[PDB]
């Protein structure tokens, strides 16, 4: 498939998933649960709403805490994950609520936080 790392990816929350079907996204949330197959997991955003993350292959490590997923929103309004990283929280807890307000700001003031070229 196309390389998503070379496209703009929109920072969204779970309430935006339905509006972003088939779009490259970046979803930051708290790990809530990993499916027994290790091929799916749930993240909750800074509003406490859940998003479902799917993988093509099983997780090869135990993830926890705040996780940032990049992928494409599927027809089901899940995210097909092409990559992810766990946010470092060993010196400061990540304020996911503040992050949510920043996501809202990004979308309300798009002229000042452009998605891709101009």
């Amino acid at each position: 498939s196309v390389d998503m790392m070379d496209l703009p990816r929109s920072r969204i929350n779970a309430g935006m998933l339905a509006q972003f079907i088939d779009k490259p996204v970046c979803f930051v949330g708290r790990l809530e649960k990993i499916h027994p197959t290790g091929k799916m997991f749930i993240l909750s955003d800074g509003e406490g709403k859940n998003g479902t993350i799917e993988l093509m292959e099983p997780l090869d490590e135990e993830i926890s805490g705040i996780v940032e997923v990049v992928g494409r929103v599927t027809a089901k309004a899940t995210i097909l994950c092409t990559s992810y990283v766990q946010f470092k929280e060993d010196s400061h807890p990540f304020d996911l609520g503040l992050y949510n307000e920043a996501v809202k700001i990004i979308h309300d003031f798009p002229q000042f936080y452009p998605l891709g070229i101009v």
């Binding site: 010196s91 503040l98 003031f109 000042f112 936080y113 070229i117």
Partner: protein, 119 residues
Amino acid sequence: HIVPCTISQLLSATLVDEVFRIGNVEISQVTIVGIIRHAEKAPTNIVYKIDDMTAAPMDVRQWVTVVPPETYVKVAGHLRSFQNKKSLVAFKIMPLEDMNEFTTHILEVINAHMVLSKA
């Protein structure tokens, strides 16, 4: 001063007679925050590929300990261009200890560019 930017904003800059602008505003010194996707080490310098999600990752050269990929950093540097490809030359590359500084940068970007848009 030093303007906080997204990579998308940097790409959008026009270059006319050795001068970069976003609008009518000269920019040279900037900060970005992003994740290292790649690091290419040479004896005298490192080139990082840095991704802030707003566009494709941008090259950032630091003149010389390499920051490991998948690390979030703040970069202070100057915008440069060659054959119409933009990149940064960094005087500071600082891995973030507190990930809230990443969130804060988003807000600083939006505020800075609002203010500059009126000037």
